[PDB]
Design a protein around this ligand. Structure first.
Ligand code: NDP
Ligand code: EHZ
Ligand code: ZN
Lengths: 114, 133, 198, 339, 385, 118, 83
C-alpha cells in the first residue's frame, strides 16, 4: 500500500479521464474510417473501441488506470493524425488471423499444449 | 490405440515408496498426435457425456487433493502412520506361508536391464543385455 | 594494466563529497569507481534539483547530456535504473547521476534542464515504460506505431509476439502471432567455476 | 500422411500436399492463400510465364509452394504433378474458348485426364470444380460442357468432391467488376430490363475456404456441395447497386438477348481476351438454380458473407476522385428478391 | 499549415526518414522527424550475445564509420577488463580510425552535394573511397563491416605491404580534396544554399547535446581526441578545425579541414608505427595464435573457452566516448561478471543532432530542410539502433 | 500526499503481453542445480524463474527445430525467492516456487578411512 | 544416397522438392576415403599426427601404436598407424 499518485488520487477521478477518452475515440471512429478509407462500419468501429476499452475494464488501481489512458490518448493522437496508416488500424480488428476455439475438445483435437 | 506420453513429456506427478510426491516437468512436447494421459481420459469422458470436472491440470491437481493429500504437497514425506491398528487386522487374517522359497525375479543383472516398456524398447539396454549374455 | 592517474581518482572523489554536502537531501550514494568515473546516486525526487545544480554551478558546469538510459534489474523492487551521463566541457570531466524508477512510479522530466533529453526520455518510455512527467510530447519513438509492450524490458521476448507478412486475400500487411522457423538457440554459457576476486 | 504439428499459423504443418492446377487465376489466388496459410504442401502447376506466378510465391512458408511447368496437351505433365500430392483440386476454366482449347477441353476433357491420373497416383481426394446451375441442357455451351464433365470426373475419381459455386464476386471478380465495367457503354443493356434475372453472388473467399475445408473434412467425399451465397438478387438491383457504390449513373436499357448474343459475338471476335462473349452473355442472363438440397458453405464451415459487406472493397477502384471516399452504410443497400 | 511526409523513400533524405512537415507556403512551419524506421534491436540483441559476437553489431550501428565505432566498444570492454591494447595495435586503430574519418567525411560532403544537386563531387571522391575500402579488405577481409578492431587490440597484423599503399594514396588524396573545393567551397551557388542556413548558437548547441562538428562549427572548442585522449591520439599532433559564424557552409569547411588534418595524423602513424604484437598477450582476453592452440594444451583450452563461452568481464559499468567522425560515439556498457553484457546503450551522435532539426530549420524552405539533414551527417543506423 | 491501494500490483494490463500467454503460462521459480558433470557451484547461486516449455515441431524444409512460444527462451534471474514471487504476481503469471536444496554438511577426515576396524 | 544416406522417401511429402531439380549428394564419400588410406607404419611406441603441415593441420595429438592388435587412429584424421 502507501503508493504515490500519478494523475488521479482516486479511481473516481481517474474514471473521469476514461470517460473523456471514450468520448474522444467515439467521436473519432467515424473520421478514421473515412480518412483511411477503411472497409469497416463506423458502428463496428465504435464497437471495437468499446471492446478495447472494456478489455481492461477489470482494473481498479488508480495508478494503473491513469497510465492506461495516457497510453490510450497517445494511440488516439497517432490515429487522429495519419501516423497509423490503415495496416496499423485494421490490425485492431484481427481480420486475417484465424480465430482459435477455446473449447477443450477443440483444442484437444488440434494442439499438444493448450 | 489411444497414444499417450512418457514422463519426459508431461507435467504429471509420481510418488516413490515413502510417499514423497514429486513433479515431472515437460522436457519435450509429446510426439505425433500423441497427447497427455489425463486429457485423453477427460476428452473420452466428454465424447461419452459423463464429463470429468477438471479441464486444466491445476484443476486435476485440485482433484488429487480431495482423494489424497500427498499428491498436492511435493517433496513432503508424511510423518504419522497407524501401525498398531494395522497389526490388529493382520492378527485377524489367517493365512499359510507356503514352503516354496521367496525369490526376487531379478536374480542377476541381465534380469535388471530390461523391465518396463521404455527399458524394453532400449537399443542401449539391448546391447547391455547381449554383453551380459 | 590501464594507465590510471591517481591525480584524477582524488579530484573526482573530492567533487563527490562536494556535491554530497551541497545537496545532502537527494544524494544517497556517491562513489568514484576504479575506472575513474563518478556516479552520484540520487532519490528520484532529486532529478530536477541535482541536474540543475550540475548544469548551472560555477564549480561544476555540466552543460551537455551525453545520455539517458534505463537498465532494468527485474529483481530490484524499483525495476528501472535511469542513468544520466553528463559532460563538462569547462572542467573536461564527467559524472553520472542515476536514480531508480518502478514501472508505474514516474520520474520527473529534465527537458527543462537539458533539451537533449526531449528525445531520450521518449526512447526510455518506448523501450522500458518509465513515464516522465512534464514532458512536452512523450510518445513512442523507436517502436512501430501500433506496437504493444515495452521491448527492452528483460521480461519481453526477443522475438516478440507479433511479426508481419503480406496477405493477398486482404491485400494488406497483417500481424500474426510470431512463428519462428528456427527458434533462437539459447546457449547456456555461464561456467560453474568462479574467478577468485583479485 | 503427415501428422499435423504446430500452432496453426505459417511455418507449421497440416499434412495436405495438394496439386491445384488453376492456381494462376482468380479463385486459385484464394485457394493457395488458405492452403498456404494452413501450412499445407501446395504444388502449383503453371503454364503462364514466371513473372505472372510471382504473386503466389509470397504466400506460404519457405518450401511450402513448389511450381511445376505443365502443358495440358501433354499427359506426362499432369502425371508428375500428382506424383507426391494427396489432395488434387481442379479449377481449370475459361469463358472464351480459345483457339487451341475449347470449352470441352477446359471443362470436361482436361479436368478428366487430371483426376484420372490422380487416382493412378493414389490421391486421397479430388475436388473438381464446375459451375453452379451447370445443367446438362443449359443454354451456354459452357454450362452444358461443365455438366458433361462432372459426369466424367465421377467415373475417373469416383466421389471426388465437386463444388458448383454461384456467381463469384471478389476484387478482380467478373460478376461484380464486369457490370461496373459496362460504364463505357453509356447505358446498360439488360434483357427484361435487368429483371427476370435472379442471381446469387458468392465472395471469392467464401468459396475458397469451403474448398480447402472440403479437403480436410471426411463428409465431403462423394458430395456435390454448391456454394451459393447469403442472399439472392434480381439482376436489376445488382446492376444498380454496383453502379451505386461505384457512384456512376445507371441507365438500364432493354436489348433483345437475340441481338445481344450478337454483341457478345463481337467482343468474342476480338483476339485479346474478349471483354465479353456470346456465352458470357447467356450465362449472365441465366437465372440461378434454387437451393435444392445440395449442402452449402456453412455446411463446410464457412458461413457465407453478404455481398454488400465487402462490395465496397471490390467496387472502390471504379469510383472517381471524390466518390472514392464514400462508405457502404451511408449508401443504400439494395433489396433482396428470393423469387 | 500544409502537412506532408517528407517520405521514407526520398532521394534526398538519407536512408529512410519520415519528416512530417507543416509548410506555410514553401516555408517549413514545423519539423517533427519520425524515427525508428531502422530500429532493429541492436541494444537488446547484444544482451543475448557474448562480447566478441557483439563486436560485429557495432560496425553496423553507423556503417559509413565502420571501424571508429568498433574502437568505442573495444575501449569500453578493455576498460572493464583493465587491459589495454599492445603499442602497435594502438597506432593501427588510430591509422584506421582516421582513414575511417576521411571515409565518413567523403560520404558526408559528397552526399550533401548530391541532395543539393551537385553530382560530380560524389563520383570524384567515391573512387578515392573505393581505394580506401581496399585497405579495409586487405587488412580485415571485408570492404566494410571488417570486425578488425576487437576488444583487445586488432585481429591480425597489417598485411606485408599495406603501409606503403596507405602512403601512395595519402600522398595524393589531398589534390582530390583540393579539386572538390574548387567546385564548391567557393561556388557562387554552394555558398548561397549553405551560408546562413541552420545557424546554431554556441549555448544552444551544448544544451541540445550536439557534441560534434556541430558544436565545433559554432566555435565551441571540443575534440574528445584532444581533451580526453584515447589510444595514441595523444602522441600525434593535429589541429581541431574550429569554426565561426556557424552555419551549413562553415561546418562543411570544418569537415573538409578534418579530412585535411586526418591526412596529417595518417602520415604520422605511417612514419611512427612500432614493431610489436597486435593483440594483448593475455590468452584470458585475446584468443591464442593458431600455431599455439594447435601445439600447446593451455592454448587450446583458452581458444575453446574464449570462442565458446567468453571474456567473462569483471562486474562494473563504464561510459567511454570517442570522437567518431559524426561526433561523440559512446557505449554505456553495464556488465555483470558474465561473458555476455547486461546493457549496452549506444550514444549515437545523431539522436541529438536530429532532435536539433526542429530548432535549426525554423522559417525555412523545403530545400533548406534537405541542406540541414546533410549538415548533420545523419546515418539512421546510429539514431535507430 | 500518497494514496492507499491494497490491490496487489498487477500491471498485467500495461506489460503488453497477448492474453493467451498470461493466462496459460506457468512459470517455475527454482535455483538451478549443478550439471553433475562439473563440481563448480557458481551456477547454483541465483534463483531463476522459467516459463513452461511448449511445442518444438521439426521444420519440413531444413529439419531445424521450430517453436511457436515467444516466452520459451526467456529465463529471468532474481537474487532472492521473495523478489521472484513478486515478479510473477504483478505480471500475472502463475508460479510454483521450489525451495532451494543445498548440500547437507558432510563430515570428512583423511584419518577415518585408514581405520582397518572400519 | 548421401553420406548418412538421406533418402527422402517414395512416400515422403518432401521428395516433392527434387522434381525438375537435382539433389546434392557426394561422390568420393569420405566414409570410404580413409579406409582407402594405407596404414602408416612406425618405429616408435607413440607417434604424433599434426594432420600434415603443422599449423595447417589438426591440434597435434600423440597416438599409442603400442598394440599391433590395433592400429592407432588419430581421432582427427582417421589415419590408422601400423606400429
Ligand atoms: N468466378 C467465376 O466466374 C466462377 C468460376 N467457376 C469455376 O472456378 C474455376 C476458377 O475460376 P477463375 O479462377 O475465375 O477462372 P480463371 O479464368 O481465373 O482461370 C482459372 C485457372 O484455370 C487456368 N486455365 C484456364 N484455361 C486453361 C487451359 N486451357 N489450360 C491450362 N490452364 C487453364 C488458368 O491459368 P492460366 O490463366 O495461366 O491458363 C487459371 O489459373 C473455373 O474453372 C470456373 O469453371 C465457377 C463458378 C463461377
Ligand atoms: C476502429 C477504430 C480503432 C480505434 C481503437 C482504439 O484506438 C484502441 C482502443 O480503444 S484502447 C482501449 C483501452 N482503454 C482503456 O483501457 C480504458 C480503461 N478504463 C478503465 O479501466 C476504467 O477506469 C474503469 C475501471 C471504470 C472501467 O470500467 P468499465 O467497465 O469500462 O465501466
Ligand atoms: Zn590426425
Amino acid at each position: 500500500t502507501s503508493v504515490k499518485p500519478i494523475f488521479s488520487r482516486d479511481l473516481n477521478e481517474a474514471k473521469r479521464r476514461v470517460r473523456e477518452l471514450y468520448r474522444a475515440w467515439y467521436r473519432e471512429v467515424p473520421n478514421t474510417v473515412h480518412l483511411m478509407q477503411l472497409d469497416i462500419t463506423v458502428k463496428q468501429g465504435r464497437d471495437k473501441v468499446r471492446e478495447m476499452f472494456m478489455k481492461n475494464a477489470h482494473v481498479t488501481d488508480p495508478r494503473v488506470v491513469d497510465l492506461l489512458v495516457i497510453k490510450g490518448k497517445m494511440e488516439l493522437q497517432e490515429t487522429i493524425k495519419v501516423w497509423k496508416q490503415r495496416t496499423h488500424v485494421m490490425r485492431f480488428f484481427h481480420e486475417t488471423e484465424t480465430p482459435r476455439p477455446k473449447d477443450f475438445l477443440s483444442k484437444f483435437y488440434m494442439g499438444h499444449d493448450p | 490405440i489411444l497414444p499417450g506420453a512418457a514422463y519426459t513429456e508431461k507435467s504429471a506427478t509420481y510418488v516413490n515408496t515413502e510417499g514423497r510426491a514429486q513433479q515431472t516437468k515437460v522436457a519435450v512436447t509429446p510426439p505425433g498426435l500423441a497427447r497427455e494421459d489425463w486429457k485423453i481420459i477427460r476428452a473420452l469422458s466428454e465424447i461419452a457425456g459423463i464429463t470429468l470436472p477438471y479441464d486444466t491440470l491445476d484443476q486435476v491437481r485440485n482433484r488429487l487433493e480431495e482423494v489424497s493429500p500427498n499428491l498436492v504437497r511435493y517433496d513432503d514425506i508424511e510423518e504419522t502412520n497407524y501401525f498398531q491398528q494395522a497389526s490388529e487386522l493382520a492378527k485377524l487374517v489367517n493365512q499359510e506361508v507356503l514352503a516354496d522359497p521367496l525369490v526376487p525375479p531379478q536374480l542377476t543383472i541381465k534380469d535388471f536391464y530390461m523391465t518396463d516398456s521404455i527399458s524394453r524398447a532400449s537399443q542401449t539396454m539391448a546391447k547391455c543385455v547381449k554383453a551380459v549374455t | 594494466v590501464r594507465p590510471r592517474s591517481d591525480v584524477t581518482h582524488k579530484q573526482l572523489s573530492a567533487f563527490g563529497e562536494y556535491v554530497a554536502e551541497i545537496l545532502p537531501k537527494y544524494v544517497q550514494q556517491v562513489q568514484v569507481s576504479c575506472l575513474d568515473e563518478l556516479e552520484i546516486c540520487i532519490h528520484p525526487d532529486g532529478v530536477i534539483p541535482t541536474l540543475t545544480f550540475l548544469r548551472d554551478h560555477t564549480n561544476a558546469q555540466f552543460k551537455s547530456l551525453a545520455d539517458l538510459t534505463a537498465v532494468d534489474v527485474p529483481t530490484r523492487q524499483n525495476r528501472f535504473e535511469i542513468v544520466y551521463n553528463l559532460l563538462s566541457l569547462r572542467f573536461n570531466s564527467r559524472i553520472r547521476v542515476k536514480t531508480y524508477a518502478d514501472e508505474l512510479t514516474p520520474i520527473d522530466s529534465i527537458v527543462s534542464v537539458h533539451i537533449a533529453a526531449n528525445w531520450y526520455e521518449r526512447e526510455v518510455w518506448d523501450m522500458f515504460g518509465v513515464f516522465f512527467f512534464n514532458h512536452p510530447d512523450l510518445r513512442r519513438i523507436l517502436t512501430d506505431y501500433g506496437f504493444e509492450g515495452h521491448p527492452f524490458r528483460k521480461d519481453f521476448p526477443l522475438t516478440g509476439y507479433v511479426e508481419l507478412r503480406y496477405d493477398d486475400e486482404v491485400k494488406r500487411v497483417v500481424a500474426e502471432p510470431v512463428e519462428l522457423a528456427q527458434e533462437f538457440r539459447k546457449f547456456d554459457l555461464n561456467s560453474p567455476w568462479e574467478a577468485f576476486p583479485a | 500422411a503427415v501428422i499435423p504439428h504446430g500452432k496453426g499459423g505459417r511455418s507449421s504443418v497440416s499434412g495436405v500436399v495438394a496439386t491445384v492446377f488453376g492456381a494462376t487465376g482468380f479463385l486459385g489466388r484464394y485457394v493457395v492463400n488458405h492452403l498456404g496459410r494452413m501450412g499445407s504442401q501446395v504444388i502449383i502447376p503453371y503454364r503462364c510465364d514466371v513473372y505472372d506466378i510471382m504473386h503466389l510465391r509470397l504466400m506460404g512458408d519457405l518450401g511450402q509452394l513448389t511450381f511445376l511447368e505443365w502443358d495440358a496437351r501433354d499427359k506426362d505433365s499432369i502425371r508428375k504433378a500428382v506424383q507426391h500430392s494427396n489432395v488434387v483440386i481442379n479449377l481449370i476454366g475459361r469463358e472464351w474458348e480459345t483457339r487451341n482449347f475449347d470449352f470441352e477441353d477446359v471443362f470436361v476433357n482436361i479436368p478428366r485426364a487430371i483426376a484420372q491420373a490422380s487416382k493412378e497416383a493414389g490421391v486421397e481426394r479430388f475436388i473438381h470444380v464446375s459451375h453452379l446451375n451447370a445443367s446438362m441442357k443449359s443454354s451456354s455451351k459452357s454450362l452444358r460442357s461443365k455438366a458433361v464433365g462432372e459426369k466424367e470426373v465421377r467415373s475417373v475419381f469416383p466421389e471426388a468432391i465437386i463444388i458448383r459455386p454461384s456467381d463469384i464476386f471478389g476484387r478482380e471478380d467478373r460478376f461484380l467488376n464486369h457490370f461496373a465495367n459496362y460504364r463505357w457503354f453509356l447505358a446498360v443493356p439488360l434483357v427484361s430490363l435487368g429483371f427476370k434475372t435472379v442471381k446469387q453472388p458468392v465472395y471469392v473467399a467464401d468459396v475458397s475456404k469451403g474448398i480447402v475445408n472440403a479437403t480436410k473434412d471426411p463428409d465431403a467425399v462423394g458430395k456435390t456441395f454448391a456454394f451459393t451465397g447469403p442472399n439472392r438478387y434480381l439482376l436489376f438491383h445488382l446492376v444498380k447497386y454496383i453502379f451505386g457504390m461505384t457512384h456512376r449513373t445507371f441507365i438500364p436499357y432493354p436489348l433483345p438477348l437475340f441481338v445481344y448474343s450478337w454483341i457478345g459475338k463481337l467482343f468474342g471476335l476480338s483476339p485479346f481476351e474478349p471483354w465479353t462473349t456470346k456465352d458470357k452473355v447467356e450465362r449472365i442472363h441465366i437465372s440461378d438454380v434454387m437451393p435444392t438440397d445440395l449442402p452449402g458453405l456453412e455446411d463446410l464451415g464457412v458461413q457465407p458473407t453478404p455481398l454488400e459487406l465487402k462490395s465496397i472493397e471490390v467496387l472502390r477502384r471504379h469510383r472517381t476522385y471524390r466518390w472514392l471516399s464514400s462508405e457502404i452504410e451511408e449508401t443504400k443497400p439494395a433489396k433482396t428478391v428470393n423469387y | 499549415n500544409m502537412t506532408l511526409n517528407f517520405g521514407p523513400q526520398h532521394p534526398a533524405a538519407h536512408g529512410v526518414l519520415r519528416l512530417v512537415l507543416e509548410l506555410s507556403g514553401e516555408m517549413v512551419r514545423k519539423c517533427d522527424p519520425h524515427i525508428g524506421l531502422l530500429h532493429r534491436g541492436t541494444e537488446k540483441l547484444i544482451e543475448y550475445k557474448t562480447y566478441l559476437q557483439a563486436l560485429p553489431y557495432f560496425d553496423r550501428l553507423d556503417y559509413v564509420s565502420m571501424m571508429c565505432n568498433e574502437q568505442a566498444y573495444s575501449i569500453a570492454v578493455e576498460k572493464l577488463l583493465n587491459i589495454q591494447p599492445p603499442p602497435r595495435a594502438q597506432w593501427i586503430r588510430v591509422l584506421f580510425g582516421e582513414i575511417t574519418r576521411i571515409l565518413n567525411h567523403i560520404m558526408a560532403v559528397t552526399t550533401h552535394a548530391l541532395d543539393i544537386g551537385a553530382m560530380t563531387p560524389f563520383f570524384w571522391m567515391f573512387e578515392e573511397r573505393e581505394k580506401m575500402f581496399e585497405f579495409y579488405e586487405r587488412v580485415s577481409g571485408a570492404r566494410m563491416h571488417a570486425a578488425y578492431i576487437r576488444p583487445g587490440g586488432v585481429h591480425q597484423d597489417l598485411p606485408l605491404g599495406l603501409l606503403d599503399d596507405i602512403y601512395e594514396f595519402s600522398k595524393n588524396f589531398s589534390l582530390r580534396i583540393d579539386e572538390v573545393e574548387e567546385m564548391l567551397t567557393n561556388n557562387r551557388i554552394w555558398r548561397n544554399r549553405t551560408v546562413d542556413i541552420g545557424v546554431v548558437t554556441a549555448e544552444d548547441a551544448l544544451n541540445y547535446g550536439f557534441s560534434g562538428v556541430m558544436l565545433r562549427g559554432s566555435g565551441i572548442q571540443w575534440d574528445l581526441r584532444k581533451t580526453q585522449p584515447y589510444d595514441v591520439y595523444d602522441q600525434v599532433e593535429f589541429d581541431v578545425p574550429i569554426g565561426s559564424r556557424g552555419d551549413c557552409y562553415d561546418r562543411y569547411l570544418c569537415r573538409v579541414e578534418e579530412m585535411r588534418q586526418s591526412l596529417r595524423i595518417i602520415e604520422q602513424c605511417l612514419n611512427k608505427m612500432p614493431p610489436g604484437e597486435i593483440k594483448v598477450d593475455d590468452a584470458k582476453v585475446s584468443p591464442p595464435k593458431r600455431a599455439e592452440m594447435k601445439t600447446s594444451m593451455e592454448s587450446l583450452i583458452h581458444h575453446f573457452k574464449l570462442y565458446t563461452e567468453g571474456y567473462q568481464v569483471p562486474p562494473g559499468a563504464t561510459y567511454t566516448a570517442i570522437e567518431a567522425p559524426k561526433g561523440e560515439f559512446g557505449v554505456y556498457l553495464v556488465s555483470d561478471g558474465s561473458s555476455r553484457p547486461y546493457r549496452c546503450k549506444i550514444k549515437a551522435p545523431g539522436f541529438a543532432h536530429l532532435a536539433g532539426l526542429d530548432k535549426m530549420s525554423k522559417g525555412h524552405m523545403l530545400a533548406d530542410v534537405v541542406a540541414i539533414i546533410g549538415t548533420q551527417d545523419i546515418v539512421f543506423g546510429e539514431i535507430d539502433r | 500526499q500518497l494514496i492507499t491501494v491494497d490491490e496487489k500490483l498487477d500491471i498485467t494490463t500495461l506489460t503488453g503481453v497477448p492474453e493467451e500467454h498470461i493466462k496459460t503460462r506457468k512459470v517455475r521459480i527454482f535455483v538451478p542445480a549443478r550439471n553433475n558433470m562439473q563440481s563448480g557451484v557458481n551456477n547454483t547461486k541465483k534463483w531463476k524463474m522459467e516459463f513452461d516449455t511448449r511445442e518444438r515441431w521439426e521444420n519440413p524444409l531444413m529439419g531445424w527445430a521450430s517453436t511457436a512460444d515467444p516466452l520459451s527462451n526467456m529465463v529471468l534471474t532474481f537474487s532472492a525467492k521473495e523478489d521472484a514471487i513478486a515478479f510473477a504476481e504483478k505480471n500475472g503469471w502463475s508460479y510454483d516456487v521450489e525451495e532451494k536444496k543445498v548440500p547437507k554438511p558432510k563430515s570428512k577426515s583423511y584419518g577415518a578411512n585408514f581405520s582397518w576396524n572400519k | 544416397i548421401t553420406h548418412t544416406g538421406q533418402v527422402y522417401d517414395e512416400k515422403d511429402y518432401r521428395r516433392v522438392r527434387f522434381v525438375d531439380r537435382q539433389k546434392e549428394v557426394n561422390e568420393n564419400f569420405a566414409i570410404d576415403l580413409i579406409a582407402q588410406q594405407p596404414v602408416n607404419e612406425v618405429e616408435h611406441r607413440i607417434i604424433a599426427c599434426d594432420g600434415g603441415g603443422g599449423a595447417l593441420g589438426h591440434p597435434k595429438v600423440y597416438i599409442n601404436l603400442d598394440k599391433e592388435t590395433k592400429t592407432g587412429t588419430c581421432g582427427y584424421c582417421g589415419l590408422q598407424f601400423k606400429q
